[PDB]
Symmetry: D3
Subunit: 256 residues, 6 copies
């Protein structure tokens, strides 16, 4: 198995003892994803990508974080929705920090954090920084971390056109949209019900945020753009593009 | 469709809670060494498995489990010096339980059952519960009720303890990665258990105190505290039904319709 | 008749807030390197200047700004390895924003506009707001409204973008110490600028991921991410009026009497 | 070009630290009520002004000041019940001081002077310094030196006290918004002072203890603890030279050039 | 020169003992908690301190000022934190206290600490304080600081002694709050703070295999005790005291041998 | 007994039940006090005064805080002396806050915090503020706290004249001096060995603080003044003044009803 959770400590110890062990940590969230998808999408997707990348480069995947930072309106609908279960920033940062500290104790020195929830970013970054600060106090400076969001690897203009033949608008309105739905169709068809999609126009917000969040500024279904044009085929395209891009990036950052 | 909150859309979840009788379950585990014969997510798999079967019988829902738990103690987990074991600081675990309870309250939920499969998590789960309730109280909510239990506590009946432990019983004290857990795994996840690797050693014994930093020489090299050589899928099935039934009834009594 | 709270008497401030409908504005910047050609308090100066002008037009008051912001990230500020750059830990920035909101609420204020001038601050400002609003609810206050915004998010009109970037626009991705900020500075604080020191280097290109510890070699030696050789006072005047008007109308719509 | 780090480019700042004996100064103030006659940023303006002058005179640099400080105490600042006064929790002020020292240490700086302008700040500035120095030790750094001082502690000359308080000096325990601060403000920021609005009331008196919640009746209505009627620009310039001079020498003593 | 209590020593006396190189320090960790109608509320501080004092005299150790406030009371372990008098700290507060103290003893040059807990619920937070402190010490280059944490009652294991304490059969520390065990030790150590006449004789408390929150006052005896101390005696107390003192004294010699 | 720890919860409940019960809490420290005194002086003195004041006005005394904030050179010698065991500020604040929260839960509403360690003050104050903030969130606003350092009641020139016949240099250098040593001779003479006093010249400091602490600026013995002229008689004088003033103040702030 490529999952650390499915290994005995002896199998894990042996892999780390090899000296060139690369670990991957998916970081997601429990969040509403419209009427058509389940709420663990942000955990499922990064974990899936990690698995496939891990199989191709010989890496191991740590148990993913199921709860992430609070959902923001302009990018995820808003934390006012039912089901969405968010952690405070300090809690997420502390979790990332504790994990990096423990991996360092194991002898691991190469970590890839794969974010599946846009809003986690800064808290993952702070957690990495606080952990490296600590490792430095303990005499460790060779621990390296690569943090990335798999969607950032779908930049090829060609690829974007096959995914958005009617023109692209940006990652800003993608919550529960074509991109994530297509991936879910390919990896978890049982958890996607395209027939429930609400084909509302893309969501537009002014250049600023309001708190407490105003429900009426987010489309009723919770999506920021219609996933009507999503397909298992598009999902397969995105997946391979992400897996190959991420696998090559890892080889480049963590060379033997 | 599913009993798992993560496998539902927010609308389905919303509907289940709006019914006003919704009971939610949260498994709290750990990524910890379990000897040479079992994978390291045992403490997550078991409570989650027990939650699913209880949820199916009483109509409850199961929240995504907490994969990381408190540090492993030598006298009940072998120690935190083992590789693979990835523990959280107490504050981090406490804060996670606290944030989740707060969010569930925001959804309108008021009935929560925390089920941990990692002995050392207990006190931090309790503090997180206490801190969340205090906070809910400041918010004007005093009807949020929480039940916290470790599934193995429901295996009390002597008749069941003879079946599992013929040659005698040395309490849950020494039991990490032993008969009990290994049996359940054999029944629930036979592919994640290789009993052929079990290192059969005599029951670990410690003095009536703890030492820090942990001295590696005071815990069997395998990481186990007792041999799981007599574990069996049959013992597993027994343990499983006993727990599912007991916990299911306990919940019905604490959260009557 | 200043718009700055710090320049007022507590009785003058009190009358303003007790008058009702009082809008407070808090600039949130940072002490960060901005190349060879600009001073390091740019992120405090710019948003403060915008606040002053907006407050003068709509009748709002401006709180003293937060001088220190969150750590600088390579893909938008060059990195926190540069000298001079003095960054706070996330929890520190978040707690500062939280404390201030709590106090304004005690004053009786209920309308706050947070104007960010440092890209990396956003999420910590957001958490501060959320933690504060949560707290106000415990106190029985649910009518406190906050609007957070970065003054640059108001420069989107194609026509305006055309005049600022004739030879093309590569986004705000690498707009640190570039044409945008440098232009604004030339128009508001020309003495703290010196285009002759600008290093006319090509745009910065980074892979679709981040690496820690930060690799100093992946950031232009000067600290800038894009050349500001084409900055000017004229462009500064354009951006300024655009932002002031856009933000002023925005505030009127979010905070009507 | 300036003594304010905020007004320098990172290159110039780096060149100054490279010298090896650069001194940095950090003003720590507060946004707090100061009666009917003065603005509320007095505690930032004054220590900032003194830092500027001291820094220019001795060749040091001034960091951006902390605009928000610890909660106002009744017996020393009227109380945190007044509107306008915007205070931070102790942990927040402490953490801010701690983070700054950590960063300055990263630049290579090793000499810092913290000039407090708000009486109640001190202990939290101290914990911040302690926690920072503890971290530096873990990181292998033990040559970072910090001097913390409240500028008013340099006005102790009996002859100076006389010129400032003919009728007598009843201590700094009721000098909130009184003759001392108002005088300095008249010498530095006269536009932010209006003696016409001063409420000439007798010196507030307090028992040897504090009560919480703070009882509004135990503090003069206007917010001041003593009258600033006798304040003057001359006294202010007197205080200014005494402080700048005194602090300037203490710094040269504690941070001798190399 | 003066006593086994660090608080009664001058810093020079303390310094002289630590300079020895193998000085053992003991820290009592108790609580201010209700103990039924028959005993005072500082029992959890008194008992461990009393055990520490005696152990210190026999092995040559010093005793630090005890922590008076401990972690919140649990219904199934101490009646519950809803009774008046009981004054508990949050987990983070007790952990931080233990952490700060260890950090300081290390600065003194001490390297051997025994934490004697007298309140069942303190255990895990003491443990986290130890772990966090040892982590800090490590960043500071210190890896030779050793900590032994124990609850004195765990040294009362011999079946023989157990029969003499419970001639009618044991019941486990699951309901030994204010029961026979603590009351006997008090009758032997502080008779003036105990009055058996007020002891409410009721059947042992029993609880399901789980806890509920908010706590339900009804699931715990009214007096606060989980079992009766009616059969408590100054004699049983003298027996328990000696067993613990000797057991712990020998355990400490084992863990901290003289250099 | 006036000690809460020596009461039964029933007896304590009965006292708070009166509705006007005043609780007193000593806050001290474990700190070096020269060659002539033990290190728990800062706990013994305020606890002793508390005891007397409580017996006199009918109040109860809570267990004292044995550990306090870090010793400062200019008022405690420095935190570099062995024996001195100090808490971080956050830990002391949190301890005060938790106790006040618990007392509020008991129904109690009157608390006097008696400090006996100079450095604790502001952290005791933050703890009080934070706890009252919480009580407010919980709908409780009738909880009143009086905080004081017992030595602040010894102001009368006549009384000082008698204690320092040959002049007085303020509390600025009283650590382990005449004042505390005199009280100890009158209250705990067995804990004082006046024969060990190191009669050195008073300590002098500039108008500022230096960090890290330089041991060279503190008399080797750890005292800031010589206690050679301390006496049981002066101890009884000081004790009279304190108990008197404090008792009167509390009856003033917490009148019976
Ligand atoms: Cl998303
Ligand atoms: Cl286990
Ligand atoms: Cl920027
Ligand atoms: Cl002041
Ligand atoms: Cl107990
Ligand atoms: Cl003192
Ligand atoms: Mn998301
Ligand atoms: Mn476990
Ligand atoms: Mn910036
Ligand atoms: Mn002030
Ligand atoms: Mn107890
Ligand atoms: Mn002291
Ligand atoms: Zn998503
Ligand atoms: Zn397990
Ligand atoms: Zn900038
Ligand atoms: Zn002032
Ligand atoms: Zn007890
Ligand atoms: Zn003292």
């Amino acid at each position: 198995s490529v999952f650390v959770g499915e290994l005995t400590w002896k199998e894990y110890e042996a892999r780390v003892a090899a000296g060139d062990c690369v670990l991957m940590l998916p970081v997601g969230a429990l969040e509403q994803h419209g009427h058509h998808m389940c709420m663990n999408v942000d955990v499922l997707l990064p974990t899936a990508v990690c698995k496939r990348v891990a199989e191709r480069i010989g890496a191991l995947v740590m148990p993913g974080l199921q709860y992430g930072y609070k959902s923001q309106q302009k990018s995820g609908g808003g934390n006012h929705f039912p089901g969405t279960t968010s952690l405070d920033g300090a809690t997420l940062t502390g979790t990332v920090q504790d994990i990096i500290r423990e991996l360092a104790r194991h002898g691991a020195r190469r970590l890839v954090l794969m974010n599946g929830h846009y809003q986690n970013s800064m808290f993952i970054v702070e957690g990495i920084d606080l952990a490296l600060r600590e490792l430095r106090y303990a005499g460790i400076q060779d621990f390296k971390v690569v943090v990335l969001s798999y969607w950032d690897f779908v930049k090829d203009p060609a690829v974007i056109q096959q995914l958005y033949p009617e023109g692209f608008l940006g990652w800003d309105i993608e919550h529960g949209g074509v991109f994530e739905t297509s991936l879910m169709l390919a990896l978890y068809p049982d958890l996607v019900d395209l027939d429930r999609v609400v084909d509302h126009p893309p969501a537009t917000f002014p250049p600023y945020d309001v708190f407490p969040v105003d429900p009426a500024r987010t489309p009723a279904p919770g999506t920021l753009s219609s996933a009507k044009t999503a397909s298992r085929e598009k999902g397969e395209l995105i997946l391979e593009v992400c897996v190959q891009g991420i696998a090559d990036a890892i080889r480049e950052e963590f060379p033997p």
